[PDB]
Amino acid sequence: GFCWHHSCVPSGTCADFPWPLGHQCFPD
């Protein structure tokens, strides 16, 4: 995952998020 200014997707979080994100699958 990554953590960028309140937009922080945890490592392992693979789920749907609002577009333009859509499905985000970040193993890291």
Side-chain angles (χ1 to χ4, degrees):
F2 66 100
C3 186
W4 178 257
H5 300 247
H6 298 109
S7 309
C8 309
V9 180
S11 302
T13 301
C14 303
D16 62 284
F17 294 83
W19 203 267
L21 287 65
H23 189 260
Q24 297 293 269
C25 183
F26 292 92
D28 65 283

